[PDB]
Amino acid sequence: LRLTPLTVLLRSVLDQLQDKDPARIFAQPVSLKEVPDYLDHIKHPMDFATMRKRLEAQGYKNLHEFEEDFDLIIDNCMKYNARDTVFYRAAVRLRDQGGVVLRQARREVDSIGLEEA
Secondary structure: OOOOHHHHHHHHHHHHHHHOOOOOOOOOOOOOOOOOOHHHHOOOOOOHHHHHHHHHOOOOOOHHHHHHHHHHHHHHHHHHOOOOOHHHHHHHHHHHHHHHHHHHHHHHHHHHHHHOO
């Protein structure tokens, strides 16, 4: 595979984000069989599986595109599920924990920026 440095970084980000989701709540697209009204509430479903697929096709051109999809995962869960639920709580935990990681990722895109030269 002919991997760009952004992709390598984003994969490390993405793996770390998944590491914080041990229950695999956001690992895969929501099932419509399991949630038939989902698209009444959510305009743009997103999950880590779909992000990895875009990543592995080197379909992120910048960190900003990656963060937008990560935000969707979080925001969709909070819009669909009540504050009272496990899905909502995990999403908050993952948002907080992943903020740390994405903030680290921004520093690192800048760091690589400095290496040249």
